[PDB]
Amino acid sequence: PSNENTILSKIFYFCVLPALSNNKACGAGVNVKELVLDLFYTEPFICP
Amino acid sequence: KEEEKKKQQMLTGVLGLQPTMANHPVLGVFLPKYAKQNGGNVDKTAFRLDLIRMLALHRLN
Amino acid sequence: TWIRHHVGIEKPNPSEGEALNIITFGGINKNPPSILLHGQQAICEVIL
Amino acid sequence: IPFHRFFSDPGICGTMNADIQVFLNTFPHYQRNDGGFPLPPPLALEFY
Amino acid sequence: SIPFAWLDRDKVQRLTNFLSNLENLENVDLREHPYVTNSCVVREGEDVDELKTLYNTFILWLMYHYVLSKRKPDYNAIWQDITKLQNVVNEYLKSKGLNKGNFENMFTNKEKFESQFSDIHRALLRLGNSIRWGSNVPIDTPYVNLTAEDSSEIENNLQDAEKNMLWYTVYNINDPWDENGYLVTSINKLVYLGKLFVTLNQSWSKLEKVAMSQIVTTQNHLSGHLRKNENFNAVYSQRVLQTPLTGQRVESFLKIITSDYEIIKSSLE
Q1: Spatial separation of the C-alpha atoms in residues E74 and E64, rounded to whole Å
Q2: Where are the alpha helices (DSSP H) in chain E?
Q3: What does the alpha-carbon distance between residue E20 and residue E8 come to, in Å, rounded to a whole number?
Q4: C42 vs C39, C45, E18, CA distance in Å?
Q5: How many CB pairs under 8 A join A and D?
Q6: CA distance A23 to A17
Q7: CA pair distance E246, D45, nearest whole angstrom
Q8: Which sign does the torsion angle of CA E48, E54, E57, E58 carry?
Q9: Portion 20-39 of A in contact with B at CB < 8 A
Q10: Which superkingdom is the protein from (chain D)?
């Protein structure tokens, strides 16, 4: 991150999202492993 | 000879891929490198994701 | 040092040894205002 | 080429050159567009 | 195991000899001596070695920067001795010692720029002090003022530090002969150790920027040659050799190109 980029990132998440959203956001996590091994690793992708 | 059995065992462990897919170039090049691993405790899922991203890198039209 | 400069006080050090010990026994600024037109003044401070 | 009072944006200059970028990342208060962050000392002749 | 290109059995030994005993020869600048870079050639004109010498010099600069970052000793010892002299002797003389100056000027002239000083005027102030303690007025030879029997040896020591910053020695301020006492020996030690510290760090940053510039230079040539062909081993060698590099990336990248050596060797035509 450039100095501009980090400052703008803090500005965005701490100001722009809660003011415009009125605190209607939520944090989110992901198993990318089980995500891609469910969606992908199927026949059109695997078969040559 | 034991090395070929290790290669084939890892091939069936990755996905149960068919030999038809074992002949694929991305497989043909990486199965030997996956042979010199997976004897460790590493994972089975890591190899699936690795094959996914490598097969993807291969197919950039 | 930055706070002393920016509030605009010299004599950079308090000289925290014997000098301060002397000062508790009692000490004036020793530099009077060279001009004075209206006599005495002092204003204390309550934060609110 | 930062040479003038104007026409010397540090956020522009430090992206073309990595030398300014490690310079601003050690001294962040020169990233300001407002005053004069230091030009090359043969160029920074303010009273002239 | 010590990876190199389509390269013979004598030049491998000469390269590994140079990169092992990098610390002992003087003038460590790989740019300045051409006996190694011209030696790491594939041979047979231009056609059978252009891309291959490009890869081989890539490995050469990369492992040169690796053995630099692995073999440079700690200079914070000599800055620790600078802080010991500068803090303990001269401040106690200026304040506790008496008839010197005031708190704000001297103590902050020493205290200021703990991190990353290249300042010569502060040095000049201490040299003016010790010269005022000494015999004469001008500032001709200030580092071991009042005696020129060691000036050539200490300039030789600083030039040898510029040549080989990896193997450095600190000469000494001799005990039995001195213009003044503990103060002027502390000042001469302080100024010589400050010059040594800034000399070592500037020479090191010079060589590190040189090595990074050469590696980033050769990557673009290597990518421009390797971009054209469309084989899978070709494009994998393209991606491995187009990974971005920094000085703290080079060690892990050497360990990566060690395992990826067996595929890019076949990927080269």
Answers
A1: 19
A2: 9-20, 50-71, 76-85, 91-94, 103-111, 121-133, 151-163, 182-226, 232-241, 250-259, 261-267
A3: 18
A4: 11, 10, 78
A5: 5
A6: 8
A7: 37
A8: negative
A9: 33, 36-37
A10: Viruses
With CA atoms as reference, the chain A residue closest to B18 would be: A47
Reading the block at residue E56, the tokens are 């081989």
Select from E166, E167, E139, E168 the least CA-distant residue to E154. E168
In the PDB record, what is the listed experimental method? cryo-EM
CB < 8 Å to B25, chain E: 232
- The span from the CA of E137 to the CA of E14, in Å, is 54
- In angstroms, rounded to a whole number, what is the distance separating the alpha carbons of residues E266 and E269? 7
**What dihedral do alpha carbons D16, D18, D20, D21 form, nearest 10°?**
100
Amino acid at C20: L
CB atoms within 10 A of CB E110: 18
CB atoms within 10 A of CB B38: 17
C-alpha to C-alpha distances, B27 to A39, B50, B55, nearest whole angstrom: 21, 11, 9
Euclidean distance between the first and final Cα of chain E, in Å?
A: 22
How is residue E186 written in tokens? 């502390």
Contact E35, E28 (CB under 8 A): no
Query: Which amino acid does the sequence have at D4?
Result: H
CA distance, residue A24 to nearest chain B CA (Å): 34
This PDB structure is determined at a resolution in Å of 9.0
Contact E261, E233 (CB under 8 A): no
Determine whether E252 is exposed, middle or buried from the number of CB atoms within 10 Å of its CB (0-12, 13-18, 19+).
exposed
The CA distance from D41 to the nearest CA of chain A, in Å, is 25
The first and second tokens of residue E51, run together, are 């891309």
Query: DSSP letter at E165?
Result: S
Task: Judge whether C20 and C14 are in contact, CB under 8 Å.
Answer: yes
